[PDB]
Amino acid sequence: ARVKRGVIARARHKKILKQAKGYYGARSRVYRVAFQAVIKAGQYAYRDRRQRKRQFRQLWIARINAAARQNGISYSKFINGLKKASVEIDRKILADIAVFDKVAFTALVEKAKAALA
């Protein structure tokens, strides 16, 4: 029962090279280089599924700080005031409001100021 390996070997190599599409040089062309490029890409994708949340929280916090200082209050004071006023709006929606509805952000800032005072 001799088994030849051509069809299955070709299928596996084509699978990996298909995932390696778009890479530079041997990373896209050669199987040995492509395979450890695909594994490295998967490792980076796992890591950056976690790191994406940190980056977006960082971005929202920076935007909230910018708008808050525009309205005359620091980010730390603003969030503390929202917590004292029991406003549970998250930082993503706070940044969206800061960009797209400045009147609403001023309203939130005055609510936080009332909470602190």
Partner RNA sequence: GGUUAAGCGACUAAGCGUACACGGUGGAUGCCCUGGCAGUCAGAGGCGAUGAAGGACGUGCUAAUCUGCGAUAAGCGUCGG
Partner RNA sequence: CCCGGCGAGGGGAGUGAAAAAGAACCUGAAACCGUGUACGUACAAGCAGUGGGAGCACGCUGCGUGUGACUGCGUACC
Partner RNA sequence: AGGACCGAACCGACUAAUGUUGAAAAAUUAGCGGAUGACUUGUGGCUGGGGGUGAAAGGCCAAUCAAACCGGGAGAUAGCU
Partner RNA sequence: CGAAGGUGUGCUGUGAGGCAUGCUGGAGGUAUCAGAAGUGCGAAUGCUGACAUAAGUAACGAUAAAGCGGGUGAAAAGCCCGCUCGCCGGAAGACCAAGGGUUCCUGUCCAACGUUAAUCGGGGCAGGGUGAGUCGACCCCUAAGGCGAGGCCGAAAGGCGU
Provide the binding-site residues for RNA, judged by CB under 7 A. 1-15, 18, 21-33, 35-37, 39-41, 44-45, 47-49, 51-52, 55
> CB-wise, 3 or 117, nearer to RNA?
3
Q: How far is the CB of 94 from RNA (least distance, A)?
A: 18
Only one residue has tokens 């599409």, namely 21
> CB-wise, 45 or 117, nearer to RNA?
45
> CB-wise, 10 or 83, nearer to RNA?
10
Q: How far is the CB of 106 from RNA (least distance, A)?
A: 26
Q: Left if phi > 0, otherwise alpha if psi is -120 to 50, otherwise beta: which for 73?
A: beta
Q: How far is the CB of 33 from RNA (least distance, A)?
A: 7
Distances (CA, A) of 91 to 58, 78, 87, 88, 100: 10, 11, 11, 9, 14
